Design a protein around this motif. Structure first.
Motif, mmCIF file in Angstrom:
data_model
loop_
_atom_site.group_PDB
_atom_site.id
_atom_site.type_symbol
_atom_site.label_atom_id
_atom_site.label_comp_id
_atom_site.label_asym_id
_atom_site.label_seq_id
_atom_site.Cartn_x
_atom_site.Cartn_y
_atom_site.Cartn_z
ATOM 1 N N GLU A 1 0.821 -1.213 0.000
ATOM 2 C CA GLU A 1 0.000 0.000 0.000
ATOM 3 C C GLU A 1 0.856 1.264 0.000
ATOM 4 O O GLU A 1 0.558 2.243 0.687
ATOM 5 N N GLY A 2 1.930 1.244 -0.781
ATOM 6 C CA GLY A 2 2.822 2.384 -0.840
ATOM 7 C C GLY A 2 3.147 2.834 -2.248
ATOM 8 O O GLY A 2 3.732 2.078 -3.029
ATOM 9 N N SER A 3 2.780 4.073 -2.581
ATOM 10 C CA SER A 3 3.108 4.638 -3.884
ATOM 11 C C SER A 3 4.600 4.874 -4.059
ATOM 12 O O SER A 3 5.038 5.164 -5.179
ATOM 13 N N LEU A 4 5.381 4.772 -2.981
ATOM 14 C CA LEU A 4 6.823 4.956 -3.085
ATOM 15 C C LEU A 4 7.452 3.931 -4.019
ATOM 16 O O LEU A 4 8.422 4.246 -4.715
ATOM 17 N N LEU A 5 6.907 2.714 -4.067
ATOM 18 C CA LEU A 5 7.431 1.706 -4.984
ATOM 19 C C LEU A 5 7.262 2.145 -6.433
ATOM 20 O O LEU A 5 8.209 2.091 -7.227
ATOM 21 N N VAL B 1 9.365 -10.459 -7.451
ATOM 22 C CA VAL B 1 9.885 -11.364 -6.431
ATOM 23 C C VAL B 1 9.389 -12.771 -6.737
ATOM 24 O O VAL B 1 8.186 -12.986 -6.921
ATOM 25 N N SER B 2 10.326 -13.717 -6.823
ATOM 26 C CA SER B 2 10.012 -15.138 -6.991
ATOM 27 C C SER B 2 9.043 -15.369 -8.147
ATOM 28 O O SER B 2 8.160 -16.227 -8.085
ATOM 29 N N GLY B 3 9.207 -14.594 -9.214
ATOM 30 C CA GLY B 3 8.326 -14.694 -10.354
ATOM 31 C C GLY B 3 6.990 -14.006 -10.197
ATOM 32 O O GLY B 3 6.143 -14.129 -11.090
ATOM 33 N N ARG B 4 6.766 -13.293 -9.098
ATOM 34 C CA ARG B 4 5.531 -12.553 -8.880
ATOM 35 C C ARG B 4 5.798 -11.073 -9.116
ATOM 36 O O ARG B 4 6.692 -10.494 -8.490
ATOM 37 N N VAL B 5 5.021 -10.466 -10.009
ATOM 38 C CA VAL B 5 5.229 -9.066 -10.362
ATOM 39 C C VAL B 5 4.828 -8.193 -9.181
ATOM 40 O O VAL B 5 3.648 -8.109 -8.826
ATOM 41 N N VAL B 6 5.812 -7.540 -8.566
ATOM 42 C CA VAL B 6 5.520 -6.615 -7.475
ATOM 43 C C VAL B 6 5.065 -5.271 -8.021
ATOM 44 O O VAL B 6 4.007 -4.752 -7.646
ATOM 45 N N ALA B 7 5.855 -4.689 -8.918
ATOM 46 C CA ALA B 7 5.526 -3.374 -9.445
ATOM 47 C C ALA B 7 6.033 -3.258 -10.872
ATOM 48 O O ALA B 7 6.991 -3.922 -11.266
ATOM 49 N N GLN C 1 17.831 3.134 -2.679
ATOM 50 C CA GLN C 1 18.431 3.189 -1.348
ATOM 51 C C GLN C 1 17.420 3.512 -0.254
ATOM 52 O O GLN C 1 17.405 2.800 0.766
ATOM 53 N N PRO C 2 16.562 4.534 -0.376
ATOM 54 C CA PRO C 2 15.604 4.806 0.708
ATOM 55 C C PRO C 2 14.475 3.796 0.799
ATOM 56 O O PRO C 2 13.730 3.817 1.788
ATOM 57 N N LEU C 3 14.321 2.916 -0.189
ATOM 58 C CA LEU C 3 13.237 1.945 -0.213
ATOM 59 C C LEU C 3 13.682 0.559 0.236
ATOM 60 O O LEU C 3 12.972 -0.419 -0.008
#
Lengths: 387, 168, 383
Positions: free
Chosen positions: C152-156, C176-182, C253-255
């Protein structure tokens, strides 16, 4: 339609002849027209497929699908010793589980006709009547519309379940019908008999292993109409999955169909005609019985006895025309899901399934299986106000 | 493994016993009961030719005219062909010319060779056609169990020469 | 669960390889040329007679053919218990999409020679036998990306956009692990097969700090060799960057902390500790308009062990749901007749957002649709 591709054919495996003409491997193929020539060509694909899947997989080929002219045609198999029977019908008119059920029913009917189906197709004198029977078969599968259209719509499901449309009966009517049939039982001995009224089974003493064959044979010749004369005196030898002759009698009079099986080792028609005449006093009572919860429709079925109960035509008379056909069409797929676990159980010798429809008004088309008690199946359409 | 996977297409007449010689060559995979329904039989026999474990995808073709246009589908892409005929049989003796012209018109010019297996015909005439159509006759018998693996090794060597030629 | 994938050159007839994953494990089983030749021959017999032989089912196994374009065919044998035709057809389409992803339409249609074609496809098995064997994602079967909702973060998304602008590319994806995060909008608008192929491709690839591989887009650029750069900054975490160590430190770096929150978020999809009915033992949701899939198997892992079993039941149930569906819902209760035994599977289509559910048998049959509606209302604000 007639122009739509379809075929039934009886090739011979292990072709061990120098000639390779069409008649070399084709014992019998129907229709011999332009609606089956393409499958008559793909017969070689069918044979190679059967042999290959025999080699790689220990089981027989259940079925196959072929894209002809942009539409898929389902083909169902059956492999015997040196012979392979094979049928093919369009998918949009005949879904695959329906096709498999039709194949098993037609093979049971043919074995009921003349011994093993090898002796059914090998002979030549039976070719014209075999063509007549398969013409009935295909015209029923493709053009069921020939009390109107309700039986045809309900067919797409009802043929799938074993049994006949059993009519709920009071104690007195059932008792007197049982007494009359036992009196009819009294050159040949009577294995049993079964009386059907206006296409509804009314009373049976015959064992299910022969009652089912009686029902499917009668149905394949359109002998169970709704709201239907003469004296049908069918008198022929049959082979009911069981040496000695096993003759069969079928007597028809005023919506009464009495089918009686005889062993071996107008004589038997006069007494049954008199029995029908004396039973003609119960037709008014049985018509009164035929006339007159949120459950809309139920196709409750029993397996060991081998009957299913459905609401009468009067009951369905009182969106309903769409309801019945949609319910049967979806119950066909639910039937497929249930025959998966059914053949699993037969191997041993899942629980239920539900559906929504809003083609309007919820539906809850629910199929339920009972295996821990006496095996049986239930199929209900009802509103969602109470579940 | 990196098998070369050379594809044999074998053409005869169907009544010369070619199936017998091929079964004698390669065991296991037979698929003998398909020539009467489809028109082609598929077999394999890996052979050690010049440091290469060459895989041999044999496609026997039905000599009957019932499966001819469909047979034309199986010729294309075949890396080599083999025309079989019998010294006892007469029809294949003149049918070899038709089979050769069809097989070269379907897929193209291929480094192939013919074979006579198991008289009504004379060896001199066979040499005449052989020299006529650029290939060499082979004397083969169903009992000698020879002069066949040499055929396949020679054809595989021809294809290996082709591959080592155009690879560079 | 024996399964064999055979890739055949339709014009010639020579098979390309015999990739197979019998028993789920990547067994190196070579299928004898008898059946390969026979199946190829029946396929050409059908093609000549203008009749496409699609599939043939036996009681034990199931075989399927199909012809892509004009010169390539794919056939499958599969003895897995619970097979339907649509699963095999999607597998065929996905393997063909993978092929055109890795070798392109060139060298796949109008083959100059098939020997160099097989030598080139030698670099392509790994993803294929990842497909055929047991997989943790169903994106192959549903043709939807197995997206996982970020915390739930637009920072990504902002960091991904900044990375894209720095690298001058519109195709960037945290996976991650073949799952699309962003991913950026361009990656979202990507073609149907490769949108699920690329994260799966990277998941199937061996873990390396940096990798550069050429691919071809089945949609848009079937011939243009787009280069894909994969960087694994964290274990099981990866960044994909497509183009037609100072690379990530000025944005990511900040993420680092949210990405840490994404290390276990892969196998455990959905926001951590999401409010869901405790009777649910596995969730699977689709968004058909956006073609986005969400497949989680461990919302409650103490009961109904062997999560691969849950995955297979959900896949089979999805196959039946597609069979029936294609304000509607369908449920299937399986197991023994004894109460308290078996499982429930529910499916509901509402607003082109078809959603599936796996539940313990104690769940109310009458309330199955009510529970499905509640889950749909709880999941709609997520995406």
């Amino acid at each position: 339609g007639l122009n739509t591709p379809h075929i039934i054919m009886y090739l011979t495996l292990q072709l061990d002849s120098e000639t390779s003409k069409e008649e070399q491997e084709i014992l019998y193929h129907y229709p011999m027209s332009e609606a089956s020539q393409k499958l008559k060509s793909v017969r070689g694909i069918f044979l190679t497929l059967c042999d290959m899947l025999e080699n790689v997989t220990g089981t027989q080929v259940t079925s196959s699908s072929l894209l002809l002219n942009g539409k898929q045609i389902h083909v169902a198999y059956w492999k015997e010793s040196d012979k392979l029977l094979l049928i093919g019908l369009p998918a949009e008119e005949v879904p695959l589980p329906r096709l498999r059920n039709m194949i098993e029913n037609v093979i049971q009917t043919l074995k009921f006709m003349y011994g093993s189906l090898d002796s059914a197709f090998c002979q030549i004198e039976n070719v014209p009547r075999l063509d007549h029977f398969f013409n009935l078969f295909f015209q029923r599968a493709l053009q069921p519309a020939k009390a109107q259209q309700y039986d045809a719509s309900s067919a797409v499901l009802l043929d799938n379940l074993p049994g006949v449309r059993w009519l709920t009966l009071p104690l007195e009517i059932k008792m007197e019908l049982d007494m009359a049939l036992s009196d009819l039982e009294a050159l040949y001995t009577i294995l049993g008999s079964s009386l059907f009224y206006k296409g509804y089974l009314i009373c049976s003493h015959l064992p299910k292993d022969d009652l089912i064959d009686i029902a499917v044979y009668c149905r394949h010749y359109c002998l169970l109409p709704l709201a239907a004369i003469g004296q049908l005196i069918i008198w022929r030898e049959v082979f009911p999955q069981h040496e000695g002759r096993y003759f069969l009698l079928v007597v028809g009079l005023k919506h009464y169909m009495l089918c009686v099986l005889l062993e071996a080792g107008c004589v038997y028609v006069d007494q049954v005609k008199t029995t029908l005449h004396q039973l003609d006093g119960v037709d008014s009572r049985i018509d009164e019985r035929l006339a007159s919860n949120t459950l809309f429709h139920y196709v409750a079925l029993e397996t060991v006895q081998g009957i299913f109960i459905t609401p009468t035509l009067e009951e369905v008379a009182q969106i309903h025309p769409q309801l019945i056909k949609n319910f049967h069409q979806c119950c066909l797929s639910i039937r497929a899901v249930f025959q998966q676990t059914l053949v699993e159980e037969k191997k041993k010798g899942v629980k239920e399934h539900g559906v929504l429809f809003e083609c309007s008004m919820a539906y809850w088309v629910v199929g339920r299986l009972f295996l821990h008690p006496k095996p049986q199946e239930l199929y209900v359409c009802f509103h969602d106000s109470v579940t | 493994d990196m098998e070369v996977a050379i594809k044999m297409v074998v053409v005869g007449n169907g009544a010369v016993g070619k199936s017998s010689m091929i079964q004698r060559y390669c065991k296991g995979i037979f698929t003998k009961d398909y020539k009467k329904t489809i028109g082609v039989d598929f077999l394999e026999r890996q052979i050690q030719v010049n440091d290469e474990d060459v895989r041999l995808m044999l496609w026997d073709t039905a000599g009957q005219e019932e499966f001819d246009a469909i047979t034309k589908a199986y010729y294309r892409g075949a890396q080599a062909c083999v025309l079989v005929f019998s010294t006892t049989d007469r029809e294949s003796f003149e049918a070899v010319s038709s089979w050769r012209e069809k097989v070269v018109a379907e897929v193209g010019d291929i480094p192939t060779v013919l074979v006579q297996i198991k008289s009504c015909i004379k060896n001199e005439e066979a040499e005449a056609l052989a020299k006529r159509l650029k290939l060499r006759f082979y004397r083969t018998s169903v009992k000698e169990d020879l002069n066949v693996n040499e055929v396949f090794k020679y054809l595989a060597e021809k294809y290996l020469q082709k591959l080592k030629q155009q690879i560079a | 669960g024996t399964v064999h994938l055979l890739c055949l050159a339709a014009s010639s007839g020579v098979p390309l390889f015999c990739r197979s994953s019998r028993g789920g494990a990547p067994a190196r089983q070579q299928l004898p040329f008898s059946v390969i030749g026979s199946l190829n021959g029946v396929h050409m017999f059908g093609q000549n007679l203008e009749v496409q032989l699609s599939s043939a089912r036996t009681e034990n196994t199931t075989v399927v053919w199909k012809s892509f374009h004009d010169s390539i065919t794919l056939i499958v044998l599969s003895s897995e218990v619970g097979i339907s035709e649509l699963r095999l057809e999607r597998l065929l389409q996905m393997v063909f999409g993978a092929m055109v992803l890795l070798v392109g339409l060139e060298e796949l249609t109008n083959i100059r020679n098939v020997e160099r074609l097989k030598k080139d496809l030698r670099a392509s098995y790994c993803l294929i036998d990842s497909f055929l064997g047991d997989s943790e994602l169903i994106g192959d079967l549903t043709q939807c990306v197995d997206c996982v909702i970020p915390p739930e973060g637009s920072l990504l998304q902002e960091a991904l956009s900044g990375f894209a602008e720095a690298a001058g590319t519109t195709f960037v994806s945290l996976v991650v692990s073949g799952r699309v995060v962003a991913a950026t909008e361009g990656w979202w608008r990507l073609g149907t097969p490769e949108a699920v192929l690329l994260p799966w491709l990277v998941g199937s690839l061996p873990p390396q700090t940096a990798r550069d591989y050429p691919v071809y887009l089945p949609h848009g650029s079937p011939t243009v060799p787009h280069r894909l750069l994969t960087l694994t900054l964290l274990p099981s975490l990866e960044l994909c960057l497509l183009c037609g160590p100072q690379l990530l430190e000025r944005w990511w770096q900040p993420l680092l902390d949210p990405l840490r929150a994404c290390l276990p978020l892969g196998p455990r999809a959905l926001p951590s500790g999401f409010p869901l009915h405790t009777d649910i033992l596995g969730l699977l949701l689709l968004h058909l308009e956006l073609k986005r899939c969400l497949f989680t198997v461990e919302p409650l892992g103490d009961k109904e062990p062997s999560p691969e079993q849950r995955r297979r039941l959900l896949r089979n149930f999805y196959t039946l749901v597609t069979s029936t569906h294609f304000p509607r819902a369908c449920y299937l209760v399986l197991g023994t007749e004894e109460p308290g035994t078996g499982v429930r599977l529910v499916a509901l289509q509402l607003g082109l957002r078809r959603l599936l559910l796996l539940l313990s048998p104690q769940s109310p049959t009458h309330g199955l649709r009510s529970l499905a509606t509640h889950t749909l209302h709880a999941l709609t604000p997520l995406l």
